[PDB]
Amino acid sequence: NPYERGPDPTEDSIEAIRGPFSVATERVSSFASGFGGGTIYYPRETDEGTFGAVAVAPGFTASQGSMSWYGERVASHGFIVFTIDTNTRLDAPGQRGRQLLAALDYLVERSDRKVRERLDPNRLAVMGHAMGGGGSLEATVMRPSLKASIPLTPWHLDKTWGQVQVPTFIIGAELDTIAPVSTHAKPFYESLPSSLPKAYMELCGATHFAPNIPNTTIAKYVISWLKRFVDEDTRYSQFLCPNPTDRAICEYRSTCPY
Ligand SMILES: O=C(O)c1ccc(P(=O)(O)OCCO)cc1
Numbered sequence: 001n002p003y004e005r006g007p008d009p010t011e012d013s014i015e016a017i018r019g020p021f022s023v024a025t026e027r028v029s030s031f032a033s034g035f036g037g038g039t040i041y042y043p044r045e046t047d048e049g050t051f052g053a054v055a056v057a058p059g060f061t062a063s064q065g066s067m068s069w070y071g072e073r074v075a076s077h078g079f080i081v082f083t084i085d086t087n088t089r090l091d092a093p094g095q096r097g098r099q100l101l102a103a104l105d106y107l108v109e110r111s112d113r114k115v116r117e118r119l120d121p122n123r124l125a126v127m128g129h130a131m132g133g134g135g136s137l138e139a140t141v142m143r144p145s146l147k148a149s150i151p152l153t154p155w156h157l158d159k160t161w162g163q164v165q166v167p168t169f170i171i172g173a174e175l176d177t178i179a180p181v182s183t184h185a186k187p188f189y190e191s192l193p194s195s196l197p198k199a200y201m202e203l204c205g206a207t208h209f210a211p212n213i214p215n216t217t218i219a220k221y222v223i224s225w226l227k228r229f230v231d232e233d234t235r236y237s238q239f240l241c242p243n244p245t246d247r248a249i250c251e252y253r254s255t256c257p258y
């Protein structure tokens, strides 16, 4: 596997606040075409090969600040992280899906050479919080060539996603009453194709805003899903299959083995 980056993982090494790669950043003007700009976090070491990329969208009326902690956390494990702002703070889930693809296209076509030369433009993912999570599902319908999708406590009015072809990892919050898992996160996951590689993780006692503050249980398995599907790295299947039993997890569902 030519996309394998970093040493062989352990349960502690995926919980590490800093991975094996150092992080540099680039700021992108809000007048970039198709999205509201953002901050790119990328690994600085080039001697192991180029990296895949994930665009990170925020929720309704939120900004990249609410998703900022993913930046260094994930990119230090060998990914290019693009925390973006939306065109307006009121953008709908469909609008946030189009803007996630616009951010990924900016990385490929127009990003700074320091970023371009570290990027594998064929290995791209999407991630989003709340309405940005509903945008992550919309992004995979709009671009089924993406490698992974991670809706965090997602909110969407449309509950059926039976045509999704991108490995999707949904994270729900037990005490979410803004996008309750019983009418949002769980219906989305169960509607995903039975054959798709997918997973659902419900955090115990978590609120709708748990993705906005550093969370090891979120971090360790966001990194595992991204390595497993953006890097095709089967060294991270051990963490995902069989289903994790972390004390922080109150409900886990998957289509293991993968
Ligand atoms: O209008 C509603 O009912 C409504 C429902 C959910 C959201 P959200 O994107 O999950 O909020 C999280 C942003 O930090 C916004 C509005």
Ligand SMILES: [Ca+2]
Pocket: 030, 031, 032, 033, 034, 035, 036, 037, 087
């Ligand atoms: Ca713009």
